[PDB]
Amino acid sequence: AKRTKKVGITGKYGVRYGSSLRRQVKKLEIQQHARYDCSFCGKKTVKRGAAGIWTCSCCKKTVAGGAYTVSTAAAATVRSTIRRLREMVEA
Amino acid sequence: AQRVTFRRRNPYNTRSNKIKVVKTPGGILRAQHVKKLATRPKCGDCGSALQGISTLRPRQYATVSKTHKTVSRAYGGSRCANCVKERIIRAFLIEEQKIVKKVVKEQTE
Amino acid sequence: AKTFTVDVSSPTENGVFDPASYAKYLIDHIKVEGAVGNLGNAVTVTEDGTVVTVVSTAKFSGKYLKYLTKKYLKKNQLRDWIRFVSTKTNEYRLAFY
Amino acid sequence: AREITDIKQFLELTRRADVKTATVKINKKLNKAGKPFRQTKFKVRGSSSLYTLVINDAGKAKKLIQSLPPTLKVNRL
Amino acid sequence: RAHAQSKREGRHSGYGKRKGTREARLPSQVVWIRRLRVLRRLLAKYRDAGKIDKHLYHVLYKESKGNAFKHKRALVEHIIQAKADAQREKALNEEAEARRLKNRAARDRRAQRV
RNA sequence: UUCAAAUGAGAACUUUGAAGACUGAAGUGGGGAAAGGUUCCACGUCAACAGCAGUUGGACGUGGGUUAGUCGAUCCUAAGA
RNA sequence: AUAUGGAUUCUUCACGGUAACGUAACUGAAUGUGGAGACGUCGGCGCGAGCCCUGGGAGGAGUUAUCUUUUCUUCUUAACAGCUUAUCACCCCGGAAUUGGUUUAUCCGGAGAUGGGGUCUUAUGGCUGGAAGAGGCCAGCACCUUUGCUGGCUCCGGUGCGCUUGUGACGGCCCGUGAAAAUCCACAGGAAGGAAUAGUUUUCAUGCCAGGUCGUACUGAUAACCGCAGCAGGUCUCCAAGGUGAACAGCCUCUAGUUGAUAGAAUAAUGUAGAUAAGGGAAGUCGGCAAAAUAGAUCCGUAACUUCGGGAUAAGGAUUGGCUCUAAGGGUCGCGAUCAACUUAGAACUGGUACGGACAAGGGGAAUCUGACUGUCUAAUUAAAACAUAGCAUUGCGAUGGUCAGAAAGUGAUGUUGACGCAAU
Ligand SMILES: [K+]
Ligand SMILES: [Mg+2]
Ligand SMILES: [Mg+2]
Ligand SMILES: [Mg+2]
Ligand SMILES: [Mg+2]
Ligand SMILES: [Mg+2]
Ligand SMILES: [Mg+2]
Ligand SMILES: [Mg+2]
Ligand SMILES: [Mg+2]
Ligand SMILES: [Mg+2]
Ligand SMILES: [Mg+2]
Ligand SMILES: [Mg+2]
Ligand SMILES: [Mg+2]
Ligand SMILES: [Mg+2]
Ligand SMILES: [Mg+2]
Ligand SMILES: [Mg+2]
Ligand SMILES: [Mg+2]
Ligand SMILES: [Mg+2]
Ligand SMILES: [Mg+2]
Ligand SMILES: [Mg+2]
Ligand SMILES: [Mg+2]
Ligand SMILES: [Mg+2]
Ligand SMILES: [Mg+2]
Ligand SMILES: [Mg+2]
Ligand SMILES: [Mg+2]
Ligand SMILES: [Mg+2]
Ligand SMILES: [Mg+2]
Ligand SMILES: [Mg+2]
Ligand SMILES: [Mg+2]
Ligand SMILES: [Mg+2]
Ligand SMILES: [Mg+2]
Ligand SMILES: [Mg+2]
Ligand SMILES: [Mg+2]
Ligand SMILES: [Mg+2]
Ligand SMILES: [Zn+2]
Ligand SMILES: [Zn+2]
């Protein structure tokens, strides 16, 4: 059965701190506790250690990432920018 | 029931003051201080516990024969079997690729 | 089958004891399967004048025998002069003093 | 304390020439059938260890008692 | 000891003799662990003895992880009912097959002998 | 709290016995750390001290007592000096 | 320090296993690398130990008008050693969808599952040695002493959401990810040293010697410490039995300890502490201050409002003892046999309608002001609306810097820092 309508994981906080702050926290807690696809072994086994460290329970590979998600949009954009600059440099 | 006392002057429940209640041939309950448990030696490549290696406190390894501390293989009680095998395969394949790269460089010039 | 012997010679020869009544009390009061009196082919109490023998196939113990003997001595005001004492395993006697 | 089961090796132990004392202990055990067999423990005092040989046969025990060297301080009981 | 024997017989257990909650007296998690463990061990026993196959075992394993089974008796009657249903449906299959083939044999004989 | 005995010049208070109670194992139990420093124990012993008492005492007088390769310190480094 | 034995070597520095790895050994300098030391907290689950509970038996004791195969009590096994013993982990075979395995907790598998067969760590347990000769419990004796004997028995089980504790595999949490070093081992490497009327090996066994110095008594607190004292104050920690009960609550008890607080006699007023009270029910009072009422558990039922999480035990009802029964909920072995513990539900009967019978244990509701909340402070007259807080915003600063130290410095904090930072509001 669905136990809460909207609070989800932030039902641990009860009525405290304000609904907006609980919602903002909820989004990033879901992100930081999710399992992500490992780019090395292809399994959905990447979980966060401390903020910015994302380790695969299978293949034991750890990658530096965002505080609450494996890859920030800024990092993806930087990866694309560096790829473009490198391709221009090498060709 | 019989109650026990610490046998050392340390009265605090620290990591080095752990006790077990044992019954003696006198029929009485007595605390016996227990040493901290040993940690298994671990692979230097993957961190897993090394198979076939005795697990002792650090200085106890000076009091046991070589057989308890090693495994008859290329990295013994240092690296696990799978990590050693990966080292073998990587070394061989990378050396072969080095030869291939050298000849490709020589034949592309 | 287990055998339990009780040497009553000392109180008998000192005079204040009766082995026949002790054996009769044992037969009357030994319980079998909770019920008293049905020592049917499982418990035999026999008398020799100096040694009372109890041979048992049912549940029976030296502790139970001592319990019954102490009960008999208390009923007959015989304690403070007669002690039920084990000399060897399942061989007891009535020490008189 | 160490237990030994080889009779020849126990004899070598009694002859080790650092062993100066032994003790022959008699037990009254039951080997799971209720009859009281007689066990014999021969304990030779080595310098670092006490070696015990257990024989459950009184015949072999008497044979070894005879076979002990006459310089050993046998210490019956 | 006398009070313990009385409690074993079922006395001194009414609502006026209870002061902790039902969970405090016996955790529902403990009850659930006991029940799920007996169900899992019965399913393993049946699969290993061949009374059920591994596919029905997997279905029943998921169902037993779900509540879906009040006790070992409920699981056993469910398995018996499933096996009896399979028996009845296979019997009907065989009966229909036999009737079809026999009618077709009669028809073929009539045709080829006309 | 009580009864009796013993000791004593002297006993509500000492000792032994009996009885009645309590702490009720998060103790009024058994050990320790800091601190104290002999208070520990025995013998003798009551002027002072124990806000009554005292033959008793953590008192007074005189003595006895603390045994380690393995328990600690000692060694290591911590914040720091 | 050392000499034998063992091992090793004519293929000099061992063999066996496909492998995981095994072993009594089985060369190994510099140098390098790795491991151990070495690490949070909480939650459930598994296992162990000790304790608790309990059956049979072998003793001792208690009760015995009556009853009670009964009540109490002893029945124990150290460090160390050998063999053996795990979860996890790993190896070989094999190739998996009808996806399977599987935990209480949903993870795992073509990056090789399930399955079959193996390897390993030895927490831990078992057996044996230690070691019954010890300790325990008894009996029969002798007894002007030291006191001495003489014997017997010290056995075999069961149970668990039990308590305490150790541990394992996990899982939750973090803008928190939860010491260091001494020290010990291993590996890589291959310097060097190495055999045949013989060389090699004190990581195998046995053997020899030594281990200094200081502390060590006792209390550890309603009398050994501090508080002017033999002060109702304060002062860190370990062990922890039975019953009731959710319970380390309260109440009673076992082991152990204590019975110490100046006493005796009376029972006026006024007190201090504890209680009760007809009828009324806050009229008392600044004010319901104080007290009372409520209270456990089971079942029913639960409003406004709301940040949808709560409010909530809202409110408001009912029931509860004892006894005799009924039903359901398990293990193991081959439907049957056997073994085992509590929890739940129901029914009849029963009584001065009592029954969470002592103990223990919410009063509730409608609103306003105020501070969001948890938290913090005036030790010794103020606990609050004060402070803090998360959130919001502003400010400075790119290191030859901001802010702030220092008498000065070839001096410092932030800073093991770098704007998602530091500093100031
Ligand atoms: K090994
Ligand atoms: Mg090994
Ligand atoms: Mg509970
Ligand atoms: Mg639950
Ligand atoms: Mg007295
Ligand atoms: Mg009290
Ligand atoms: Mg009491
Ligand atoms: Mg004294
Ligand atoms: Mg005075
Ligand atoms: Mg005086
Ligand atoms: Mg005098
Ligand atoms: Mg003195
Ligand atoms: Mg030490
Ligand atoms: Mg060899
Ligand atoms: Mg497998
Ligand atoms: Mg604890
Ligand atoms: Mg001491
Ligand atoms: Mg002390
Ligand atoms: Mg104390
Ligand atoms: Mg003082
Ligand atoms: Mg209970
Ligand atoms: Mg009134
Ligand atoms: Mg009234
Ligand atoms: Mg009214
Ligand atoms: Mg008024
Ligand atoms: Mg008025
Ligand atoms: Mg007014
Ligand atoms: Mg009030
Ligand atoms: Mg209510
Ligand atoms: Mg309300
Ligand atoms: Mg506030
Ligand atoms: Mg104040
Ligand atoms: Mg105040
Ligand atoms: Mg404020
Ligand atoms: Zn991966
Ligand atoms: Zn590895």
UniProtKB/Swiss-Prot annotation, chain B:
InterPro entries per record: Ribosomal_eL34, Ribosomal_eL34_C_sf, Ribosomal_eL34_CS
Location, primary (coarse class): cytoplasm
Subcellular location: Cytoplasm
GO molecular function: structural constituent of ribosome
Gene Ontology cellular component list: cytosol; cytosolic large ribosomal subunit; preribosome, large subunit precursor
GO BP term, example: cytoplasmic translation
Function: Component of the ribosome, a large ribonucleoprotein complex responsible for the synthesis of proteins in the cell. The small ribosomal subunit (SSU) binds messenger RNAs (mRNAs) and translates the encoded message by selecting cognate aminoacyl-transfer RNA (tRNA) molecules. The large subunit (LSU) contains the ribosomal catalytic site termed the peptidyl transferase center (PTC), which catalyzes the formation of peptide bonds, thereby polymerizing the amino acids delivered by tRNAs into a polypeptide chain.
Family: Belongs to the eukaryotic ribosomal protein eL34 family.
The name this protein goes by in its record: Large ribosomal subunit protein eL34A
Gene: RPL34A
From Swiss-Prot, chain C:
GO biological process terms held by the UniProt record: cytoplasmic translation
GO CC terms: cytosol; cytosolic large ribosomal subunit
Protein task: Component of the ribosome, a large ribonucleoprotein complex responsible for the synthesis of proteins in the cell. The small ribosomal subunit (SSU) binds messenger RNAs (mRNAs) and translates the encoded message by selecting cognate aminoacyl-transfer RNA (tRNA) molecules. The large subunit (LSU) contains the ribosomal catalytic site termed the peptidyl transferase center (PTC), which catalyzes the formation of peptide bonds, thereby polymerizing the amino acids delivered by tRNAs into a polypeptide chain.
UniProt organism field: Saccharomyces cerevisiae (strain ATCC 204508 / S288c) (Baker's yeast)
Note: Present with 60400 molecules/cell in log phase SD medium. There are 2 genes for eL22 in yeast.
Record flagged with keyword Ribosomal protein: yes
Subunit-level organization: Component of the large ribosomal subunit (LSU). Mature yeast ribosomes consist of a small (40S) and a large (60S) subunit. The 40S small subunit contains 1 molecule of ribosomal RNA (18S rRNA) and 33 different proteins (encoded by 57 genes). The large 60S subunit contains 3 rRNA molecules (25S, 5.8S and 5S rRNA) and 46 different proteins (encoded by 81 genes).
Subcellular location: Cytoplasm
Protein name according to UniProt: Large ribosomal subunit protein eL22A
Gene giving rise to this polypeptide: RPL22A
A molecular function (GO) term: RNA binding
Sorted UniProt keywords: Cytoplasm, Ribonucleoprotein, Ribosomal protein
Superkingdom of this protein's organism: Eukaryota
Curated annotation (Swiss-Prot), chain D:
Main location (coarse class): cytoplasm
GO biological process, one term: cytoplasmic translation
Superkingdom, taxonomy of origin: Eukaryota
Subcellular compartments: Cytoplasm
InterPro entries reported in the protein's UniProt record: Ribosomal_eL38, Ribosomal_eL38_sf
Short name of one Pfam family: Ribosomal_L38e
GO molecular function: structural constituent of ribosome
GO CC terms: cytoplasm; cytosol; cytosolic large ribosomal subunit
Key words, A-Z: Cytoplasm, Ribonucleoprotein, Ribosomal protein
Keyword Metal-binding: no
Family: Belongs to the eukaryotic ribosomal protein eL38 family.
Function statement: Component of the ribosome, a large ribonucleoprotein complex responsible for the synthesis of proteins in the cell. The small ribosomal subunit (SSU) binds messenger RNAs (mRNAs) and translates the encoded message by selecting cognate aminoacyl-transfer RNA (tRNA) molecules. The large subunit (LSU) contains the ribosomal catalytic site termed the peptidyl transferase center (PTC), which catalyzes the formation of peptide bonds, thereby polymerizing the amino acids delivered by tRNAs into a polypeptide chain.
SUBUNIT field: Component of the large ribosomal subunit (LSU). Mature yeast ribosomes consist of a small (40S) and a large (60S) subunit. The 40S small subunit contains 1 molecule of ribosomal RNA (18S rRNA) and 33 different proteins (encoded by 57 genes). The large 60S subunit contains 3 rRNA molecules (25S, 5.8S and 5S rRNA) and 46 different proteins (encoded by 81 genes).
UniProt miscellaneous comment: Present with 50200 molecules/cell in log phase SD medium.
UniProtKB/Swiss-Prot annotation, chain E:
Origin species: Saccharomyces cerevisiae (strain ATCC 204508 / S288c)
Protein name: Large ribosomal subunit protein eL19A
Taxonomic lineage: Eukaryota, Fungi, Dikarya, Ascomycota, Saccharomycotina
Covalent link location (Glycyl lysine isopeptide (Lys-Gly) (interchain with G-Cter in ubiquitin)): 83
Family as reported in the entry's similarity comment: Belongs to the eukaryotic ribosomal protein eL19 family.
Phosphoserine sites (modified residues): 28
GO cellular component: cytosol; cytosolic large ribosomal subunit
Protein function: Component of the ribosome, a large ribonucleoprotein complex responsible for the synthesis of proteins in the cell. The small ribosomal subunit (SSU) binds messenger RNAs (mRNAs) and translates the encoded message by selecting cognate aminoacyl-transfer RNA (tRNA) molecules. The large subunit (LSU) contains the ribosomal catalytic site termed the peptidyl transferase center (PTC), which catalyzes the formation of peptide bonds, thereby polymerizing the amino acids delivered by tRNAs into a polypeptide chain.
Full protein segment contained here: 64 to 177 of 189
Location within or outside the cell: Cytoplasm
